[PDB]
Amino acid sequence: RVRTRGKRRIRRXP
RNA sequence: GGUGUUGACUGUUGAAUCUCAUGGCAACACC
């Protein structure tokens, strides 16, 4: 999954 | 309040990565 924080791309596993 | 680190969930696609979309707080450290 790809999470997004404060308009920031976060890559977390699937 | 600013900076850094960590992380769950919906759709489509395709096929171990990458890009796009959803939600929106929490924890720890430093100044």
Render A1-14 in DSSP notation, one character per residue: -EEEETTEEEE---
Q: Which amino acid is at A3?
A: R
Which nucleotide's C1' is closest to A7 (Cα)? Answer: B24
Q: Which nucleotides of B are covered by protein (CB under 7 A)?
A: 6-9, 17-26
What are the start-end ranges of the H helices in A1-14?
none
Largest CA distance in chain A: 20
- Sign, CA dihedral A6-A1-A10-A7, equals negative
What's the Rg (C-alpha) of chain A? 7
Q: How was this structure determined?
A: NMR
Angstrom distances, CA of residue A13 to CA of A2, A8: 7, 16
CB under 8 A, 24+ apart: contacts of A1-10: none
Give the C-alpha distances (Å, rounded to integers) separating A8 from A2, A5, A13. 10, 5, 16
Beta-sheet pairing, A8-11 with A2-5? antiparallel
Distance A4 CA to B19 C1' (A): 13
